[PDB]
């Protein structure tokens, strides 16, 4: 079983999952001065005012809040992407200290967290289907800094204390994914692939250029949480995230001057 741990960590995946080293891996670092302005992009159109969650989830490598993809509802449309994406889920990465945590990077500058926001594309029928397609999924990413409380996470974080092991869960209904979002839409896209096993190359990535803030005890919650099942040793959830992977042959665009 993969994990973020020296045996078992990023450097390891390639043996159980060789599209490790592939062509379109992620996440990336990006240089702001070499990704080109591209006014053919189009505005990101968010559509969370519908959005149903269902549960909060441990799942051994994250915590996930999950929702109900059965009709649109919560969709991802226009910026990059062609046709309608909905939202399945979102989680986050993170580190034992704000100097590290999130996947993406800008500059080389790493955040202290990194929100990922999942979609499958509607036109493959269902995520498992969609996972197999290069333009199977679009995620929204969005960056997290140390500083001021963001209200609209708190009802996650006042829940993490139920589901500290892995395998726990816990009724997560009635939340809005809207109080999430920064207040700009400008975005880098690139195409990329999922950051944990089976790391497919399926994903249309549009990372935001704003970060949020959130408070030093919100993210101390998320540093709460544990890898393990419950009785184990206890081994802290901090620094779940893959390192930058080589661009290669791929060109990031930014939607901004
Ligand atoms: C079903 C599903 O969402 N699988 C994922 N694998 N990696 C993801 S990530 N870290 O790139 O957002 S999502
Ligand atoms: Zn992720």
């Not at 080293?21 to 070499?34: A, F, L, Y």
């Not at 200290?97 to 926001?117: I, N, P």
């Not at 960056?143 to 409380?149: I, T």
């Not at 393990?228 to 390192?243: C, I, K, S």
Request: charged share 25%.
């Amino acid at each position: 079983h993969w994990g973020y741990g020296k045996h078992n960590g990023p450097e390891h995946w390639h043996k159980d999952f060789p599209i490790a080293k592939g062509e379109r891996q992620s996440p990336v670092d990006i240089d702001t001065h070499t990704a080109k302005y591209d006014p053919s992009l189009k505005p990101l159109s968010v559509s969370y005012d519908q959005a149903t969650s269902l549960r909060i989830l441990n799942n051994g490598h994250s915590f996930q809040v999950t929702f109900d993809d059965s009709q649109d509802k919560a969709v991802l449309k226009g910026g990059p992407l062609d046709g309608t994406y909905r939202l399945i889920q979102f989680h986050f990465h993170w580190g034992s200290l704000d100097g590290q945590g999130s996947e993406h990077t800008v500059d080389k500058k790493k955040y202290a967290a990194e929100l990922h926001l999942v979609h499958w594309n509607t036109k493959y029928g269902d995520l498992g289907k969609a996972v197999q397609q290069p333009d199977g999924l679009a995620v929204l990413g969005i960056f997290l800094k140390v500083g001021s409380a963001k209200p609209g996470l708190q009802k996650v974080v006042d829940v993490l204390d139920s589901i500290k092991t892995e395998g726990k869960s816990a009724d997560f209904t009635n939340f809005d994914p809207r109080g999430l979002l920064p207040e700009s839409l400008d975005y880098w896209t690139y195409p990329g692939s999922l950051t944990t096993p089976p790391l497919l190359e399926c994903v249309t990535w549009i990372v935001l250029k704003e970060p949020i803030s959130v408070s030093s005890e919100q993210v101390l919650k998320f540093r709460k949480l544990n890898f393990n099942g419950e009785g184990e040793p206890e081994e802290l959830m901090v620094d779940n995230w893959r390192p930058a992977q080589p661009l290669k042959n791929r060109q990031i665009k930014a939607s901004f001057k």
